[PDB]
Design an enzyme around this catalytic site. Structure first.
Site, PDB file in Angstrom:
ATOM      1  N   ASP B  19       0.861  -1.181   0.000  1.00  0.00           N
ATOM      2  CA  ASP B  19       0.000   0.000   0.000  1.00  0.00           C
ATOM      3  C   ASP B  19       0.896   1.229   0.000  1.00  0.00           C
ATOM      4  OD1 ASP B  19      -1.764   2.080   0.433  1.00  0.00           O
ATOM      5  OD2 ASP B  19      -3.024   0.939   1.820  1.00  0.00           O
ATOM      6  N   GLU B 111       0.649   1.809  13.554  1.00  0.00           N
ATOM      7  CA  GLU B 111      -0.370   1.809  12.504  1.00  0.00           C
ATOM      8  C   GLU B 111      -1.502   0.922  13.012  1.00  0.00           C
ATOM      9  OE1 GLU B 111      -2.611   0.425  10.387  1.00  0.00           O
ATOM     10  OE2 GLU B 111      -1.474  -0.079   8.576  1.00  0.00           O
ATOM     11  N   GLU B 120     -10.807  -3.955  14.439  1.00  0.00           N
ATOM     12  CA  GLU B 120      -9.669  -4.723  14.942  1.00  0.00           C
ATOM     13  C   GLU B 120      -9.264  -4.313  16.351  1.00  0.00           C
ATOM     14  OE1 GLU B 120      -6.404  -5.518  12.080  1.00  0.00           O
ATOM     15  OE2 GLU B 120      -7.689  -4.493  10.616  1.00  0.00           O
ATOM     16  N   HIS B 268      -5.678   0.235   1.150  1.00  0.00           N
ATOM     17  CA  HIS B 268      -6.238  -1.069   1.486  1.00  0.00           C
ATOM     18  C   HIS B 268      -7.415  -0.951   2.449  1.00  0.00           C
ATOM     19  CE1 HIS B 268      -3.640  -0.729   5.097  1.00  0.00           C
ATOM     20  NE2 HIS B 268      -4.430  -1.644   5.631  1.00  0.00           N
TER      21      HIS B 268
HETATM   22  N1  SAH Z   1      -1.451  -5.896  21.194  1.00  0.00           N
HETATM   23  C1  SAH Z   1      -0.527  -6.042  20.239  1.00  0.00           C
HETATM   24  N2  SAH Z   1       0.775  -6.098  20.600  1.00  0.00           N
HETATM   25  C2  SAH Z   1       1.699  -6.278  19.651  1.00  0.00           C
HETATM   26  N3  SAH Z   1       1.535  -6.425  18.335  1.00  0.00           N
HETATM   27  C3  SAH Z   1       0.236  -6.367  18.010  1.00  0.00           C
HETATM   28  C4  SAH Z   1      -0.827  -6.174  18.867  1.00  0.00           C
HETATM   29  N4  SAH Z   1      -2.029  -6.154  18.173  1.00  0.00           N
HETATM   30  C5  SAH Z   1      -1.662  -6.346  16.929  1.00  0.00           C
HETATM   31  N5  SAH Z   1      -0.311  -6.483  16.751  1.00  0.00           N
HETATM   32  C6  SAH Z   1       0.403  -6.669  15.500  1.00  0.00           C
HETATM   33  O1  SAH Z   1       0.573  -5.394  14.925  1.00  0.00           O
HETATM   34  C7  SAH Z   1       0.555  -5.499  13.485  1.00  0.00           C
HETATM   35  C8  SAH Z   1      -0.531  -4.607  12.903  1.00  0.00           C
HETATM   36  S1  SAH Z   1      -0.184  -4.075  11.206  1.00  0.00           S
HETATM   37  C9  SAH Z   1       1.619  -3.947  11.220  1.00  0.00           C
HETATM   38  C10 SAH Z   1       2.053  -3.114  10.036  1.00  0.00           C
HETATM   39  C11 SAH Z   1       3.386  -2.405  10.266  1.00  0.00           C
HETATM   40  N6  SAH Z   1       3.325  -1.469  11.425  1.00  0.00           N
HETATM   41  C12 SAH Z   1       3.715  -1.623   8.994  1.00  0.00           C
HETATM   42  O2  SAH Z   1       3.456  -0.396   9.002  1.00  0.00           O
HETATM   43  O3  SAH Z   1       4.183  -2.277   8.036  1.00  0.00           O
HETATM   44  C13 SAH Z   1       0.301  -6.976  13.163  1.00  0.00           C
HETATM   45  O4  SAH Z   1       1.548  -7.588  12.856  1.00  0.00           O
HETATM   46  C14 SAH Z   1      -0.335  -7.503  14.453  1.00  0.00           C
HETATM   47  O5  SAH Z   1      -0.101  -8.894  14.626  1.00  0.00           O
END
Ligand code: SAH
Ligand code: 6D1
Ligand code: 6D1
Ligand code: 6D1
Lengths: 353, 330, 332, 353
Positions: B19, B111, B120, B268
């Site tokens: 994205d 993010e 989510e 996305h």
């Molecule tokens: N409570 C939590 N603690 C740690 N990681 C978490 C979380 N809730 C979600 N995540 C993780 O956070 C990510 C969300 S999207 C990650 C995208 C990344 N920041 C980028 O910009 O490329 C996923 O990998 C998910 O598994």
């Protein structure tokens, strides 16, 4: 554990609808049940996973005296509304709960169910279908009665290249200033562990199929925990084998006639489509060569199988071993007509316009 | 849960990395505000591949703590080693709620936005991570604006009504399904429609709801109340509400905005539309008032209730929506 | 009954029917090409309106024509007969053909009694009643009528009507809940015959036929009309209803002439007629669609229609009511 | 009679829908009831010809204690279904039957109805509305309270020619060999006896409108059997007068405020449109001339009026006398924007683009 997600998925009316609108499937079941009315009229029937209840209604159209409809999802709630509004409350009994944990009043004369998944075995509902035989009378019958799995080697260069094209996203030294190369191998491994859910032209197949038969009348719930499918293919064509293609048939063996439901690539499509397992290292073969090996399906806790495919060209000794995860397949279908392989023209296409 | 398995696949991290608007806006927002990162401590909540921590390291951060709960943490640490940044990016496997950090941080980056911003329920973890935040610390993104607006789309409405009418057949293979006609309609129209659309179909200027991540508490997002008062610009049929969102990175050198609006290039996230079972009629000049109420649920999502009425005529519409069963119309 | 003859009492309606070139020209050609069936004979025109058919009979050589008309159009008809100098050959008799008395028995009866789906308006009964004035070897123009049925698929029409009916699915129309009546609304709209033309592509099976022989039939036959059908499906799709049209044949001594309102032929003021199923039926090519169309006569000189259709392979059954008295004119 | 055909027409839900969907009509009634809630709060109401019941529901929203909703068509059955499902059975009593022949438990404080037809008077439901005053308390109110019928002379050469064009079908000496000329005069007469239902650009009007008011609080049922509308127009423009144009307003005079419902050509369109009566012999008049005459509506047995319009230009004595039948109007509306008359351009159109 993961059963929660599974019964959540089948609790939506739109999913039952997707399955009911598969005309091949529902039509073949309706044909098979009604054409064998002697196997149903005034007998006891068990519907294992009745969903909407469609199969129990079909059983009622055949004349069953009493039908026990077991359902473990919240679809049991809606299923009972259709029985009351169809004024069949006296012949269809809805039982909410799992066929393993419920209690049935009596032994039944025949069991009906639609427990097939991708590659027949996916979702591991055949284990519940066979478990239900503890309520089956010594001479009882089962619809479907037997299920046949089919295998054949295939060649598809574009499907195979597609995986490295997707994975090569990781092979750049500066993705926004970050080097991703170190993950290319891991990305490749991930994409190849996905069986591909799609259709194809039958001309990509390079040897007659091989069939593993599961006889639901003889099989035990434990037979489905380890499925070993040996294969010995005689190549019809001499190409690069990029993997194996899977489909299945089931048969309803009734008193009057036997009815077939088939998901072959030569038959009208179904919501099961076909499944293809890619080899990470394709195998070269001559025509007449023998591709020998094993397909081993190992049940896992997450309601699926770990698939191990070992294949070797006996004349050249060239070997390929692959691992796949059937619970995370890649849905590739588009709707487009399947393009034919290149080199399938034996006469001038220009002299055929 | 199913959630952390989903994001343990490299293909998902790829889909979100590819994205371009999202990633490039995050990098440009961080780099042009390199003063909020120079020689500082950073926390990246949910680092996935680690892309954001790398952006932070490019901005000069002295040390970055990258928390990740899925199996992606293993792969993330492989990129840290092969990029020779192992002294500045520290991957910590686990949930940001459960891990222990050596020190407090000057800034939190993340993010956490989903469909309609709130999907989510990762904003709660982004906010919860403030327990590791110094008294004057900063957050990227700083604020989030949710935008909602009424729309007219006859084709979409009949599209869903068509599928719901399968359950109206009095004799589908000889079986009467009509008894379930009502449950079918409830279920289908309880599906958020995830897709884009041309701005032509919006019948009023949007209304905005602000979430300030610096000031908000994890509890605020247990129940979110969005009141709206639309002034209708066009006459016709209101088939529902459309949602999209913006987020702002309020840094020392400049503020940078990331938007998923229908006038901007696609992300996305696309946009989200909630359908009314029965559309509402409104004339130009009318006011469409009501409330959108989001109550958190245990399955990582929200139960959505949308109450809307045309104040002039008294026409009322109440709809409940399941952000857990979207309809991707792509 | 009063409202029926007031309607055909306006000169503008007679014009609308006279300006149907296919109709009027086919009647003239059928009459004139078979002039031996008219030369020096006695004729009865049942429901002459302006008189057009009696003028065709006089053109063909008939010695005397009795033109019966029950609306006030009888007086205008008398005026055209005087100014066309045919007072010695065309005799207008005001009143209903059921109630008038004629000076002699006739050699041939001519009429234009067809309505939508042939049977609408229930004028065929009066055409048949007039047979009491017919000599033993007399003839009738039209001689036979063929109703044609065929299943069709038309999604836009179905949703067009469903949209109308769904007005009554509102919880708060100005604060009032109308949803309690959605079921009555759908029943009413889908009870409406759709009068329109259409492209023959939407037909999914060759048409089935039901024939009425006007020389043999009796006025009573038409009080209850039972039409069986068995369609062999040619395309796979959703069947949204049945389409109706009709042909009539003038079986004369010299040649047979056909008048058709089929959708492959030029348009007529009859257009075609379609009956919508509330719930469409799915059928694959090769399946069979069997059922019955039943027309039960009622007091308002129209019919209560019941259409039961069934896919034999799947058991999908559909039963529909239709009121010819409340058609939906869709043509524009 | 024609009563049968009349009450059959209003029993179809599609007809009630057509009238409910007229936003001007239904919205104005809602505003007129709700904004005068003191005329309804905890009072007794009579809704004459309720149809769907919509007005009764509006009166309930305003706080009425009891509403008697009288309906003669089979729409009465469906009206009761809405009252039950809206949980108002204790405040709205549907009474099936004709307001002339039914009995009410008690006298009411206010009467509401929608009795207007084309030219206000068509269909003759104002007589039933005024007949209902036998149930009104000595100081009761009526919504609508007064009606204004507006008349105005117009010029429209294309509408006028359209009639001879249609009638001249009959002026051919050989229509399939038949001479039709003898019926031309009768055909012309027929078409000119049709009032034309349509809208139009107000610039075809040649004099300020004249108005005839009915005060529903004071008017008697017999006043409407013979209605004499004198008119005296002062021509603003010089031209050919092809007839008169009709429209109407009604006013709801409540305690708090007066609300107006208007079908004027200057206002948003409604399902009543406007009505025009053509003169078979148009009258020439130059600006400053006076067009005087009378419009006489004589009630007939088939629920309509025989209309007589006699007009003369006093300066020239040129007379025109026309008879129209309001039960066979010609519905001419299409939806096209009404093109403005020529030549209303006082400045060069080319100098404006
Ligand atoms: N409570 C939590 N603690 C740690 N990681 C978490 C979380 N809730 C979600 N995540 C993780 O956070 C990510 C969300 S999207 C990650 C995208 C990344 N920041 C980028 O910009 O490329 C996923 O990998 C998910 O598994
Ligand atoms: N352990 C169980 N006990 C009872 N029902 C189960 C169980 N596991 C799965 N099911 C039920 O079977 C239904 C789905 N199943 C086809 C899936 Cl390929 C049958 C659908 C329908 N009866 C058709 O045949 O078309 C689902 O509703 C599912 O809940
Ligand atoms: N029972 C009856 N007795 C006498 N006349 C009747 C009777 N029923 C109907 N009619 C009359 O015949 C005319 C019917 N009309 C078209 C039917 Cl779609 C034929 C017009 C005329 N023959 C043409 O084609 O131009 C009407 O004028 C009607 O009044
Ligand atoms: N004498 C009578 N007694 C009882 N009912 C009558 C009588 N005369 C006419 N009506 C009834 O009133 C209804 C007509 N009316 C519109 C006339 Cl343009 C309905 C408007 C309705 N209140 C709306 O606004 O939706 C019809 O249903 C008719 O049957």
């Amino acid at each position: 554990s993961s059963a929660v997600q599974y019964f959540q998925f089948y609790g939506y009316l739109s999913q039952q609808q997707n399955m009911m609108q598969d005309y091949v499937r529902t039509g073949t079941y309706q044909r098979a049940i009604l054409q064998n009315h002697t196997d149903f009229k005034d007998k006891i029937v068990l519907d294992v996973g009745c969903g909407s209840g469609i199969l129990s209604f079909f059983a009622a159209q055949a004349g069953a005296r009493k039908i026990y409809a077991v359902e473990a999802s919240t679809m049991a709630q809606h299923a009972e509304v259709l029985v009351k509004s169809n004024n069949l409350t006296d012949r269809i009994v809805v039982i909410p709960g799992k066929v393993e944990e419920v209690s049935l009043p009596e032994q039944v004369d025949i069991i009906i169910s639609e427990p097939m998944g991708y590659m027949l075995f996916n979702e591991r509902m055949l284990e519940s279908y066979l478990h239900a035989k503890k309520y089956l009378k010594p001479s009882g019958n089962m619809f479907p009665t037997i299920g046949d799995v089919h295998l054949a080697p295939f060649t598809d260069e574009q499907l195979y290249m597609e995986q490295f094209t997707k994975a090569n996203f990781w092979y750049q030294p500066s993705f926004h200033g970050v080097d991703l190369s170190a993950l290319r191998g891991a990305a490749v491994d991930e994409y190849f562990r996905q069986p591909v859910v799609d259709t194809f032209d039958i001309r990509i197949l390079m040897a007659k199929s091989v069939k593993y038969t599961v006889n639901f009348l003889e099989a035990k719930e434990g037979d489905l925990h380890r499925i070993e499918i040996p294969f010995k293919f005689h190549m019809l064509h001499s190409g690069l084998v990029h993997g194996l293609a899977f489909w299945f048939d089931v048969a309803f063996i009734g008193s009057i006639m036997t009815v077939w439901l088939s998901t072959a690539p030569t038959e009208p499509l179904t919501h099961w489509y076909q499944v293809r397992c890619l080899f990470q290292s394709p195998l070269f073969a001559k025509a007449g060569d023998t591709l020998s090996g094993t397909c081993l399906l190992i049940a896992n806790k997450r309601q699926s199988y770990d698939i191990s495919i070992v294949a070797q060209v006996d004349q050249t000794g060239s070997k390929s071993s692959n691992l796949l995860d059937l619970k995370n397949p890649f849905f590739r279908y588009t709707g487009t007509t399947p393009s034919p392989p290149p080199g399938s023209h034996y006469t001038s296409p220009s002299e055929n316009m």
